[PDB]
Amino acid sequence: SKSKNILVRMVSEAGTGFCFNTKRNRLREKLTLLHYDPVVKQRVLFVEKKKIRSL
Amino acid sequence: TKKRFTPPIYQPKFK
Amino acid sequence: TEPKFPAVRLALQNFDMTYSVQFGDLWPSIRVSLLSEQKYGALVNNFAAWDHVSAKLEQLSAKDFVNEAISHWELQSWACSPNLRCFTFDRGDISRFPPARPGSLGVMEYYLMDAASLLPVLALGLQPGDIVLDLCAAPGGKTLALLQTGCCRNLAANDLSPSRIARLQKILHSYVPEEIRDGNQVRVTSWDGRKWGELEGDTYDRVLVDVPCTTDRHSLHEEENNIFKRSRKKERQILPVLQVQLLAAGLLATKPGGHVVYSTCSLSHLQNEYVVQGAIELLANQYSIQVQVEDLTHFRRVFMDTFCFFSSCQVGELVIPNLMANFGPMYFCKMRRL
Amino acid sequence: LTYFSARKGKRKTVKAVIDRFLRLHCGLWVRRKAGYKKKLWKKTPARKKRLREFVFCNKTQSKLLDKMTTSFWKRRNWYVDDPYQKYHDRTNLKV
Amino acid sequence: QKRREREQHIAECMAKMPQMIVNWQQQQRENWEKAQADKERRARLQAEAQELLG
Amino acid sequence: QDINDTVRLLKEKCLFTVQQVTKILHSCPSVLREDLGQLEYKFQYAYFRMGIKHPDIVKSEYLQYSLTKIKQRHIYLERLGRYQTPDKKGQTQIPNPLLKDILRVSEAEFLARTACTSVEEFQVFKKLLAREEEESESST
RNA sequence: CUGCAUUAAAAAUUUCGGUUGGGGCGACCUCGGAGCAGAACCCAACCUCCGAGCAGUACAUGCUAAGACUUCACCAGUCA
RNA sequence: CAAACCUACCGAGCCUGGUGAUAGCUGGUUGUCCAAGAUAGAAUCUUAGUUCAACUUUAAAUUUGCCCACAGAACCCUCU
Ligand SMILES: C[S@@+](CC[C@H](N)C(=O)[O-])C[C@H]1O[C@@H](n2cnc3c(N)ncnc32)[C@H](O)[C@@H]1O
Ligand SMILES: [Mg+2]
Ligand SMILES: [Mg+2]
């Protein structure tokens, strides 16, 4: 039951403070995704800040 | 088979 | 914990009483290595940045023994499976390879496994545009090396356990690009190996048979799913009869003139040499099939630099673990169907 | 449930139901969904959507909660700007 | 004060938001081309490897 | 005080007799400097893993030797099969080598007589053993 | 002598999950697929087994909302 | 050291009190007459019990309920 993926938090770069969680591989660089931000009603970039847990 | 003993009961002598 | 007589100790006790006479004075030398951490080898993924990985590994003071081996192949004088790159540390070196990291191509840079596990692949003698069959493919120690060669147009991988075959798919996805596995070039199936004698008889040119066996290195360490558990005691006794059938099934499936490699991770000749003798006797009497065992002394003479070999073998080649080189234990024999 | 208290001799109230359920004056009970804050990453958006509403209880549960709650919580309240004010009475209910 | 400060924080971030969006997309595309170029060399290095044999 | 709890450790925790403790102090004066934790671990290592009783360890001056050196020599023999830990009954299926030739003798003759192996294999094992101990200590 | 800590000593309170004739030694307890259960649904063992306790690809895998289904209750789950 | 003996029942004396101890266990549960009235399951340190459900009873509101003519309910697999 080796934990190969990790749950990480994605924080918007728009400064709205909106966050959402997604799973990622341990042996990978930090993900900079493009996700919809409900605060600004448009898609903005999200960068990874902290690791939540390992699954 | 523990030793089981019931001592006799004496009725009162007034009867 | 366990009540009494742990399976790890039971395996060691059986090993002691069996290998004391089998190996003589060499038993204490290999006993420590079985009880000591094994030395890992780094097979370079050709689909990844092999040149950069090789350059990176060399900076960690690692040498390509396969590339060194082919250099001495002509020096000593069917060749072997080409375009294979595996890096191992020097004799007596204790450093371990760092965990593999995916490259810019999205595939894993390299794989970590026992070095002796690569020996059956080399002795198979892969040729371009060939057909490869793999009995007991999971978890994919042999299969990944076979796909690194890239000399097989179609590959058939079979293993009984769906759980282990599941992890075989994971390593194939992480290493091999999907387009190579998209077609029927790579085929993964989960049925009994004895059925290949009737499923596709005289079909495959190259077939690799790695029968299940009492893995000496794993038994002395892992405490779960142990072959020496009293519940598996019945299964352990009937291990050779399944091994001789599995070798027979592979010998039936291969085409005449094909090459067969029988490999096992053990040191007892009961599961190494007698099984090979039993299979050739069974085919001669039952199916009237003539098979010739090739001599691999020339194969052995190139590998004493990084490997330790037992020089009292009868039919195959046995690799003994040692403190200087902990690779093994691995046995492999090459035979050709006539 | 304490049917007769030792200090006043009157029925008590189970505070467990007060912290978990809301009762409307019409007799309906409003509750949340179990596990609506647990393991949100492994649940589909449709499942998560239907996990975060407020749902009513059936007849047996409503009778169960009424018996465990004294008459104080069954009174009519007139809170200012109460969000659930419109739900305290039933409209167009036949039988 | 905090509502104004929060709002102007979004305005400052959203003013330059398209700038790093296209920069990130450019970086995403540029490494993909580099990987393909490396594969072309890898496919090339096989060519003389076959050529050296023959 | 540091002398007080040391002999209390030996007499009570290690269960040594009064005469044995005095012999330990006289034969091995170096027991006083180091802490109690590693001495108790050294003593229990011999009592359990080596299966040697009190009169043997007070006569062979086992405590005065380094904990690292005794671990390397004992584990190597146990993995070689030359040494076997006594069972619950105290019975060993093979003759246990005497404590005298394991530790009192130099490594060159110790390898030649009991271990019967080359020097470079022992050096490789020494690095291997030191690796596991620091992983075990880090884990614990 | 008092208060706060650390070691021991001597003690205090409480308990012994179920299934497999019994014991020993072991096995099982949750979820899914086919057989029984032949045609709406449902249908049991000491049942015959086979597996599962993941992964992959997205990053609108966003937000609301009619109407419905259910592992024979509830909890929960499903479609839209 | 016989787990002996400590006022004719000592693996922990006797009396009183807490005490109307507790007991999913056993036993018991008092006049007359009439009517309705039986065997799907789930969970459970649970199968000697309990809760939900089903069944059953009473009162009230409403209108359809049972029976059932055609038509209709899958394929790999014809115990058609
Ligand atoms: C000794 S392992 C070899 C692993 C792998 N081939 C390698 O070299 O690293 C053999 C595996 O084959 C599987 N196996 C056993 N019997 C089999 C059979 N009859 N048919 C197919 N696979 C079988 C077992 O699960 C066992 O783990
Ligand atoms: Mg009572
Ligand atoms: Mg009647």
Which SSEs are present, and which pair or pack?
This is part of a larger assembly, with chains A (55 residues), B (15 residues), C (338 residues), D (95 residues), E (54 residues) and F (140 residues).
Chain A: E1 5-12, E2 19-25, E3 32-37, E4 42-54
Antiparallel strand pairs in A: 1-2, 1-4, 3-4
Chain C: H1 7-23, H2 27-35, E1 40-44, H3 50-59, E2 63-64, H4 65-76, E3 86-88, E4 110-114, H5 119-124, E5 130-135, H6 141-149, E6 152-158, H7 162-175, H8 178-182, E7 186-189, H9 196-199, E8 204-210, H10 216-219, H11 233-237, H12 239-253, E9 254-264, H13 273-287, E10 291-293, H14 297-300, E11 317-319, E12 330-337
Parallel strand pairs in C: 5-6, 5-8, 6-7, 8-9
Antiparallel strand pairs in C: 1-3, 1-4, 2-3, 9-12, 10-12, 11-12
Helix pairs in contact in C: 12-13
Chain E: H1 2-15, H2 17-53
S-adenosylmethionine binds next to helix 6 of chain C.
Chain A binds 2 RNA strands through residues 1, 4-5, 10, 20, 22, 31, 33-36, 38, 43, 46.
> What class, by secondary structure content of chain C?
alpha/beta
Count the beta strands of chain B.
0
Q: Please give the count of helices of chain B.
A: 0
Structural class of chain B: little secondary structure
Bound molecules: S-adenosylmethionine, magnesium ion
So how many helices of chain C?
Answer: 14
Largest contact between chains: C-F, 15 and 16 residues
- Report the end-to-end length of chain C measured between terminal Cα atoms: 53 Å
Say how many strands of chain C there are.
Answer: 12
PDB class: ribosome
Keywords: mitochondria, maturation, biogenesis, ribosome, gtpbp7, MTG1, LSU
Entry title: Human mitoribosomal large subunit assembly intermediate 2 with GTPBP7
Chain A: 39S ribosomal protein L33, mitochondrial
Structure characterization notes:
The structure is cut from a larger assembly and holds chains A (55 residues), B (15 residues), C (338 residues), D (95 residues), E (54 residues) and F (140 residues). Chain A has strands spanning 5-12, 19-25, 32-37, 42-54. Chain A is built from no helices and 4 strands. Chain D has 95 residues and is an alpha+beta fold. Chain D is built from 3 helices and 3 strands; from the N terminus they run H-E-E-H-E-H. Chain E is mainly α. Helix content of chain E is 94%, strand content 0%. Chain E has helices spanning 2-15, 17-53. Chain C binds chain F through residues 16, 25, 27-29, 31-32, 35-37, 92, 94, 322-324, and chain F through 76, 79-82, 116-117, 120-121, 123-125, 127-128, 131-132. The complex binds S-adenosylmethionine (SAM) and magnesium ion (MG) (2 copies). The structure holds 2 RNA strands.
